Amino acid sequence: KVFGRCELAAAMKRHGLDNYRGYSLGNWVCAAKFESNFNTQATNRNTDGSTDYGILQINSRWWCNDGRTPGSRNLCNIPCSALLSSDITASVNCAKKIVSDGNGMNAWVAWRNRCKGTDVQAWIRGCRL
Fold this sequence. Notes:
Layout: H1 5-14, H2 25-36, E1 43-45, E2 51-53, E3 58-59, H3 89-99, H4 109-114
Antiparallel strand pairs: 1-2, 2-3
Helix pairs in contact: 1-2
């Protein structure tokens, strides 16, 4: 599913992301934008052989099981498949764990490179929230 910008902001809010660990809603929407372009079925192979999954491009080395990343973990205790459904619950629950891991949203390289210190509130302008 390819979400609308405000449609994603709303689902993210309903799922408790707005200000989770101090990150306002605009940060999460900005990160989703640059990670997947709001497409839940986005996947991307990393050099080390792990794979990134779904709206927030959550990785198979630490966070999910795809059965094809030697030496990896599944700390969110889900199949990586679950990160590609229309339903974002699994992705949100798994992002909550990642963002709590010590580095805040720096765990997402595109957030640090493209959202950090920008006017992230732009990403929720004109949304019914």
